[PDB]
Design a binder for this molecule. Structure first.
Ligand SMILES: Nc1ncnc2c1ncn2[C@@H]1O[C@H](CSCC[C@H](N)C(=O)O)[C@@H](O)[C@H]1O
Ligand code: NA
Lengths: 265, 265
């Protein structure tokens, strides 16, 4: 009578840890959701074939409203697994599902998996220099989210990098690209005019982390805003003050303009 | 002709990803480093047994000074693997190694794995709320470093959580405990008197992230500074103002006192 939260990783079914795989193979019932992120290199079949079980995919509503009615009941008499993209507790609200499990008298365990939050290390930017993170959300009707713009400003003033999770509407199969995120940011800059995000701002794009050939690009907005970074998922990063070696990496590995090697201390 | 940077995960030999294990097994040579961190829930022998390859351990100097004379030469005519605890490229000096690979005409690919950076999500604290990260270092001789205290100050001041890595002496296999870290911080608070870290400060301790039975504890320094958090390694987090959902998780899951539901929200 246990519930396992198991991350599947960044790109394909093999990004799962061996610990999670062996545990998943021996669970009675296996559930999962694919609305918190996109694993571009795999399919449900591949996942099912890898763990040797049929997986019941749950919708956001099934989880947020009926987790305790669909999943927990079974966990009271069996060993149940709940699979998610990346790490199950990073930039999701799944952590609260553990409280529900507790209230239903169900023991829960977390099996971590590679996450985009730590994968940013592949950009060459020192991971400890990242500040507050934010999400660039799609404007809805007359509602135009902008708080993520202030997060960048706040981190930039402190010389810290800003990681920007990009929006996702799984049901509409919509995955915000770094380009769309750059366009939204420019529109917010146009209205707020804080000199936070312009055509001359240096940004970094990481696409399909987890795959062997992710797209890692660094450069000025004016040049990257119309560039093709490949299929989603994407994340956008606005670096703060760069260390010489961060700039060297961005140039040598992310194809940034050599001139960023010239750091303004 | 190929060098693989492969993460070993958080705690034991099963924390590597299925993808990382397959690739490691197919490599001609396998190197590893255990100076940036250790795999406390396993041994070199168990890791070597799992991969079925002999693992040549490299020291900090081997890597930082001679990576190109020890690892890259073999990577020119074979498939080589470089294993590191956690997620590759997280340790600040590792990203530069890919530049060294490029300069040597060696292709490199990164195979991610869980990192404490994302695994701390198990504390219930929202990831986007973490600010700049830092390391608590042991004072030595006439050197009393305190920047990690200022980091906590700048983060907390902006409502952000501060992730604190604790000092480690890999070669001597000696870890700084959360208890020791708190003592130092109270000591630093006594000299700077900035009202950042006191007996009433709320803190979270995460130990053995990755294992199925990690220690997640939250409470005030006055009650935790002498509590036994078990075997290392320990991770210390000084949360900023909490969101009610975070506080509820720390209470129900991390045994935090209900007092935080009114005092720290
Ligand atoms: N492989 C990947 N490459 C690029 N961005 C990714 C990614 N996986 C997730 N993201 C980013 O994160 C968003 C989902 S947020 C949920 C993150 C997940 N729990 C994790 O641990 O990674 C996506 O919309 C995208 O912006
Ligand atoms: Na961070």
């Amino acid at each position: 009578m246990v519930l396992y939260f198991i991350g599947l990783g960044l790109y394909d079914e093999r990004d799962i840890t061996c610990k999670g795989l062996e545990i998943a193979k021996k669970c009675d019932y296996v559930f999962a959701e694919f609305y918190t992120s996109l694993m571009a290199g795999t399919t449900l079949g591949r996942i099912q074939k890898l763990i040797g079980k049929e997986i019941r995919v749950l919708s956001r509503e099934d989880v947020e409203l009926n987790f305790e009615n669909i999943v927990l009941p079974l966990a009271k008499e069996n060993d149940v697994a709940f699979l998610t993209p990346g790490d199950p507790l990073v930039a999701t609200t799944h952590a609260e599902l553990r409280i529900r499990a507790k209230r239903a008298g169900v023991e829960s365990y977390v099996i971590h998996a590679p996450s985009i939050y730590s994968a940013v290390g592949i950009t060459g930017l020192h991971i400890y220099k990242f500040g507050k993170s934010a999400t660039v959300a799609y404007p809805e009707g007359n509602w135009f989210p902008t708080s993520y713009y202030d997060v960048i400003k706040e981190n930039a003033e402190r010389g810290l990098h800003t990681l920007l999770f990009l929006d996702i509407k799984a049901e509409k199969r919509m995955y915000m690209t770094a380009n769309e995120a750059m366009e939204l940011l420019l529109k917010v800059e146009d209205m707020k005019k804080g000199g936070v995000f312009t055509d001359d701002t240096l940004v970094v794009v990481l696409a399909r982390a987890g795959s062997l050939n992710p797209t890692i690009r660094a450069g000025y907005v004016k040049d990257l805003i119309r560039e093709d970074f490949g299929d989603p998922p994407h994340i956008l990063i606005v670096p703060g003050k760069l260390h010489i070696v961060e700039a060297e990496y961005l140039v040598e590995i992310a194809g940034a303009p050599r001139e960023i090697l010239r750091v303004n201390v």
